[PDB]
Amino acid sequence: TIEERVKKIIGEQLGVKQEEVTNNASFVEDLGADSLDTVELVMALEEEFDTEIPDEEAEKITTVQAAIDYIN
């Protein structure tokens, strides 16, 4: 469904496939994306949904599941 956006974009931003990401893991260390890569991921998510996410809320996406939690 609409989550297909996130679970797609994440992979396109991290080089992993759609099913590679696990909800329990964390982007910062368990996916290999460093600070710059995570900034790029969150900002691409911002672009895709034509919305805005301030720094404080944006910093709360270190886990895989959060990417949908703030979305839906």
């Binding site: 080089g15 790029e40 900002m43 691409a44 672009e47």
Partner: protein, 50 residues
């Protein structure tokens, strides 16, 4: 004066929008190159971090 700064905010917002497309489109290609480069080139030969 402040309404012109608001309209400045709108102009700056569209500039930000442009920059954002640039960034995401660039990463899409970085992905592919770093996929192919893993044939031992990136290890130390191409990645001349100096």
């Amino acid at each position: 004066e402040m309404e012109n700064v608001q309209k400045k905010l709108r102009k700056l917002e569209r500039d930000y929008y442009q920059i954002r497309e640039q960034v995401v489109s660039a990463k899409a290609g970085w992905c592919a190159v770093m996929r192919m480069v893993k044939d031992n080139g990136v290890e130390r030969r191409l990645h001349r971090r100096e």
